[PDB]
Amino acid sequence: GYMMMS
Amino acid sequence: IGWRREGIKYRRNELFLDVLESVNLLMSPQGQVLSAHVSGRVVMKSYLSGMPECKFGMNDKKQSIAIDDCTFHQCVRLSKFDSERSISFIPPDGEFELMRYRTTKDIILPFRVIPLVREVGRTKLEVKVVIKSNFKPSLLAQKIEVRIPTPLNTSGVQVICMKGKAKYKASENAIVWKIKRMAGMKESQISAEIELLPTNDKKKWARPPISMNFEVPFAPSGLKVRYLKVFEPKLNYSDHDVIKWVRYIGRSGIYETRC
């Protein structure tokens, strides 16, 4: 699924 | 600029990256990779204000992957990728394909298929297939299908499988084993008895490969996104204002294991 990007 | 209009405004400046990979495998009966490749594309869905200048960073040559070749959307400054391997671009608004790429080296094969047969004379095959998931245990594969071909003189099939469901499909001479979820570093097995009809002694059966379908939430090529920097020099939002998302969707292509 979508992950918050660093 | 032809692919982007000039007055775009959003309150919520957000972007979504999709790394979409098809992993392909032909594996020998002794466990040697005969052929393997990944086909990938990166789709971007951006809702950014104005005319932002973006930079896409990945782990191109701790983990750094080798890209055999690739092609970009016309918005990518190719010459910046030609003397510094920097993917710079003003993105179109909404959804577009940023790049396509192909990998053959150091591929993560998400599943290992281990088959086993036992010809009980001319009446039956006693067969067991084991699948092993080879990825982080905190990740789940989904939509797993293991497809076990049966001889054309099959009169009936019995299966036992503690996980998933399996049906014999005589129209397709295959046992289809379906598993909804499987986490990484796990084993599951199916047993089948295949009852045989009499058949021509000379006419033999070239055992087709066991094949797999799956979806995994990582890139089998090993590709990781490191950054997507957004710089809009005229407007008063900066990189850290942008809400950024990544997802990896790796799917099987040809994923065949020879028996």
Author numbering:
A (entry chain P): 1 to 6
B (entry chain A): 159 to 219, 238 to 435
What do the paper's sentences say?
Clathrin-mediated endocytosis (CME) is a major regulator of RTKs involving the heterotetrameric AP2 complex composed of large α and β2, medium μ2, and small σ2 subunits. AP2 binds to transmembrane cargo proteins that contain specific motifs such as YxxΦ (Y denotes Tyr; x, any amino acid; and Φ, bulky hydrophobic residue) serving as μ2 binding sites. In this study, we discovered AP2 is also an IRS-1-associated protein. IRS-1 binds with AP2 to prevent IGF-IR recruitment into clathrin-coated structures and thus enhance surface retention of activated IGF-IR.
We also analyzed the crystal structures of μ2 C-terminal subdomain (C-μ2) bound to IRS-1 YxxΦ motifs. Importantly, the side chains of Tyr and Met residues of IRS-1 YxxΦ motifs are inserted into the binding pockets of μ2, which are shared by the AP2 cargo proteins. Collectively, these results indicate that IRS-1 is recognized by the AP2 complex via the μ2 subunit in the very similar manner to conventional endocytic cargos. Using IRS-1 truncated mutants, we mapped the central region (amino acid residues 543–865) which is necessary for the binding to AP2. This region is almost identical to that for the clathrin adaptor AP1 complex found in our previous study, which binds to YxxΦ motifs of IRS-1 including Tyr 608, Tyr 628, and Tyr 658 via its μ1 subunit. Indeed, the Ala mutation of all these Tyr residues in IRS-1, but not a single substitution, completely abolished the binding to μ2 in vitro (IRS-1 3YA mutant). The Tyr residues of the YxxΦ motifs of IRS-1 (Tyr608, 628, and 658) critical for the binding to AP2 are part of phosphorylation sites among multiple Tyr residues in the C-terminus of IRS-1 that mediate the interaction of IRS-1 with PI3K and subsequent activation of PI3K. In addition, AP2 would preferentially bind non-phosphorylated IRS-1 since AP2 cannot recognize phosphorylated YxxΦ sequence due to its limited capacity. Our results indicate that IRS-1 inhibits the recruitment of IGF-IR to CCPs through YxxΦ motifs in IRS-1.
